[PDB]
Enzyme design. Structure first.
Site, PDB file in Angstrom:
ATOM      1  N   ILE A 155      -6.664  -8.913  47.158  1.00 23.10           N
ATOM      2  CA  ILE A 155      -7.200  -8.962  48.518  1.00 23.10           C
ATOM      3  C   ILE A 155      -6.103  -8.739  49.569  1.00 23.10           C
ATOM      4  CG2 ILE A 155      -7.141 -11.459  49.032  1.00 23.10           C
ATOM      5  CD1 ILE A 155     -10.064  -8.999  49.706  1.00 23.10           C
ATOM      6  N   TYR A 156      -4.901  -9.258  49.331  1.00 23.19           N
ATOM      7  CA  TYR A 156      -3.771  -8.967  50.230  1.00 23.19           C
ATOM      8  C   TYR A 156      -3.240  -7.542  50.061  1.00 23.19           C
ATOM      9  CZ  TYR A 156      -3.962 -13.773  51.699  1.00 23.19           C
ATOM     10  OH  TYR A 156      -4.385 -14.977  52.207  1.00 23.19           O
ATOM     11  N   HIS A 157      -3.453  -6.962  48.881  1.00 25.59           N
ATOM     12  CA  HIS A 157      -3.178  -5.540  48.672  1.00 25.59           C
ATOM     13  C   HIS A 157      -4.062  -4.676  49.567  1.00 25.59           C
ATOM     14  CE1 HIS A 157      -2.483  -1.658  46.801  1.00 25.59           C
ATOM     15  NE2 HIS A 157      -3.784  -1.549  46.607  1.00 25.59           N
ATOM     16  N   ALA A 180      -2.985  -4.811  53.187  1.00 25.95           N
ATOM     17  CA  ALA A 180      -1.763  -4.015  53.340  1.00 25.95           C
ATOM     18  C   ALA A 180      -2.022  -2.511  53.453  1.00 25.95           C
ATOM     19  CB  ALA A 180      -0.800  -4.295  52.194  1.00 25.95           C
TER      20      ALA A 180
END
Ligand SMILES: [Ca+2]
Ligand SMILES: [Ca+2]
Length: 637
Positions: free
Chosen positions: A265-267, A270
């Site tokens: 999810i943070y990928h 980004a």
């Protein structure tokens, strides 16, 4: 009006031919009008770029009720600076220093001037000049009342780089929507351009050298130079933005395209930061200033996401990650498709398979982040396994190397336990740490203890139509390596080979987890567990060890979203490691149709040698034999 007001502008810029000749002749008023006419024509040649914001304001989504409210309240100087508070009245003569409540953020966020974009949007939708009149008035009001240097009180709240950056990003599409109004005078143009320039250039000499501000501050500075390339400083603003974005992308994303924190999810978040900068530049043909490697990497980040995406559009819930909305994800892919319009895989994901083409790969390794996907296809009823065997992460990563999510014919059979909770109170922390335990993941433990690190070394990765093979080794404990091999056979089933290698003695456990509704049968006689779904889409997981191995059920939980959890089945195959000799587990993960679990036995053939990595086994499945002849390691003369 004067000569000085054109000082920051590049008069030899293409389009300003009439502005330069007019400034050369001392006809400054005609020069400003010529500049206005250039800007008006330019604004009509494209849509306003709203894409860079965290929530892109769509020009064609019918004016939302909340958006129309904000623009109407702004006419009477009622502003909602902060999303966690309601409106306040700032007066017929706007007091930009007002303290409606004793909270710094309410003052800071006021100077993000969110309602200006709403006024611009409503003006574009209705064509009603009252909105344009009020905005031109309000920008002039703001500018004349909040000059840099006014006071150390006002500078603190109005000229903090964060807000300055927010304004350099929001102002260009606002400008674009208002510049064609007869309220937008040639004199206001010059007041605006010179005010905007001061802000962008201030940003260029004040952006953060490090931290979580650096990225968007420099990114927004690039956007300034992209949006107003007529300023003399513009090339430099774009260059500094690009070099910071580039430095950071090389630090934050691996060669395989995966972002360093190891959370799907943070990928995804980004992707947006790095992609929108490029996309905004590309819309106006300034994207050539990005190095090729940057552009390749951003595309790889999307391809990496595609590789770890399950048929329901979710990503595995590794570390701090959760289930997400398919429609919104599809809109993200659609936004990305505009930037990379030749990429048929991105188009395929944007349109749920209706257009474009399935990605030109099946099973795939992301070898730096250590994400491995085994898949039969990309269709809705594909068998897909995503497995994590990664290097070290940070806050958003867990001690879970080996774990996997296995999706079969529309069902996720082995969802990761998930996050459940952010950091907080000591009581809330014990819950967070429960979800970070190794023993609740699909991997090997020693005495049920957490592995001390995720630092996998890939020993082998090979793909094939009939056979994909992964072997990696993790140094899970100081006295014990865990080597795991995963074989995806005939695009149907998996063999999982686990080796506990080292001096450590104790209780070895290979843990497994299932979906909350699978109501499994635990069969200790044959060391197999199988689901009992009435639709006949079922899974068996069975230990094929020749030596004594126990099966025990464990406490299991799964959290699909924050603050919500469900009980679910979990279990472990166990055996002692009595001395320094290596211990081997052989497990089969076998999908099947119907209510009758298959009967599976195993014979070790002559030439089978786990130590050499020579797998030579005969599986008998409901009476029928099949050979598994596979080298588990590589480069071993
Ligand atoms: Ca800052
Ligand atoms: Ca987890």
């Amino acid at each position: 009006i004067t000569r000085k007001d054109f000082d920051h502008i590049n008069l030899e810029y293409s389009g300003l031919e009439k502005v330069n000749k007019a400034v050369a002749a001392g006809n400054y008023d005609d020069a400003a009008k010529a500049l206005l006419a250039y800007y008006r024509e330019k604004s009509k040649a494209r849509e306003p770029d709203f894409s860079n914001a965290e929530k892109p304001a769509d020009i064609r989504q019918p004016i939302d009720k909340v958006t129309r409210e904000m623009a109407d309240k702004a006419l009477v100087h009622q502003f909602q600076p902060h999303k966690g508070y309601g409106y306040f009245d700032y007066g017929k003569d706007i007091n930009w220093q007002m303290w409606p409540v004793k909270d710094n953020e309410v003052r800071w966020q006021l100077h993000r001037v969110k309602w200006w974009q709403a006024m611009a949007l409503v003006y574009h939708a209705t064509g009603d000049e009252k909105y344009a009149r009020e905005w031109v008035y309000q920008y002039s009001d703001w500018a004349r009342k909040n000059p840099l240097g006014l006071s150390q009180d006002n500078d603190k709240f109005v000229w903090r780089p964060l807000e300055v950056s927010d304004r350099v990003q929001s102002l260009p599409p606002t400008f674009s929507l208002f510049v064609n109004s007869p309220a937008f005078t040639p004199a206001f143009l010059m007041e605006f351009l010179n005010s905007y320039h001061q802000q962008a250039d201030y940003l260029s000499t004040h952006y953060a050298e490090q931290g979580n501000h650096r990225l968007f501050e420099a990114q927004r500075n690039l956007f300034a130079g992209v949006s107003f390339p007529e300023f003399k400083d513009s090339p430099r603003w774009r260059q500094t933005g690009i070099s910071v974005l580039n430095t950071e992308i090389k630090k934050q994303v691996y060669a395989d395209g995966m972002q360093f924190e190891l959370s799907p999810i943070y990928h995804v978040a980004a992707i947006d930061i790095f992609l929108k900068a490029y996309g905004s530049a590309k819309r106006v043909n300034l994207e050539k200033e990005f190095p090729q490697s940057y552009v390749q990497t951003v595309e790889n980040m999307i391809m990496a996401l595609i590789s770890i995406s399950l048929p329901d559009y979710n990503t595995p819930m590794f570390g701090d990650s959760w289930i997400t909305d398919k429609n919104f994800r599809m809109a993200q892919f659609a936004s990305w498709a505009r930037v990379f319009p030749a990429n048929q895989a991105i188009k395929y994901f944007a349109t749920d398979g209706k257009q474009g083409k399935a990605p030109n790969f099946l099973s795939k390794a992301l070898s730096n982040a250590g994400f491995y996907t085994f898949r039969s296809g990309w269709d809705k009823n594909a068998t897909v396994m995503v497995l994590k065997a990664s290097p070290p992460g940070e806050f958003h990563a867990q001690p879970d190397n080996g774990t996997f999510e296995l999706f079969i014919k529309g069902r996720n059979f082995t969802p990761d336990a998930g996050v459940f909770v952010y950091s907080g109170d000591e009581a809330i922390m014990k819950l967070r740490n429960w979800y970070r335990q190794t023993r609740i993941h699909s991997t090997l433990t020693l005495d049920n203890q957490n592995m001390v690190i995720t630092k996998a070394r890939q020993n082998k990765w090979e793909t094939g139509n009939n056979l994909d093979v992964l072997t990696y080794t993790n140094p899970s404990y100081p006295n014990l390596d865990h080597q795991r091999s995963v074989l995806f056979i005939n695009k149907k089933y998996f063999l999982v080979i686990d080796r506990a290698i080292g001096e450590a003695t104790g209780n070895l456990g290979v843990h497994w987890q299932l979906k909350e509704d699978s109501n499994p049968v635990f069969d200790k006689t044959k060391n197999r567990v199988y689901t009992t779904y009435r639709d006949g889409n079922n899974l068996m997981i069975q230990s094929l060890n020749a030596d004594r191995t126990s099966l025990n059920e464990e406490e299991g939980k799964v959290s699909y979203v924050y603050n919500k959890e469900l009980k679910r089945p979990a279990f472990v195959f166990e055996k002692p490691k009595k001395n320094a000799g290596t211990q081997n587990f052989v497990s089969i993960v076998y999908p099947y149709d119907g209510q009758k679990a298959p009967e599976i036995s195993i014979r070790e053939n002559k030439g089978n040698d786990f130590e050499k990595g020579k797998l030579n086994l005969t599986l008998t499945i409901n009476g029928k034999q099949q050979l598994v002849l596979v080298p588990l390691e590589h480069h071993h003369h």
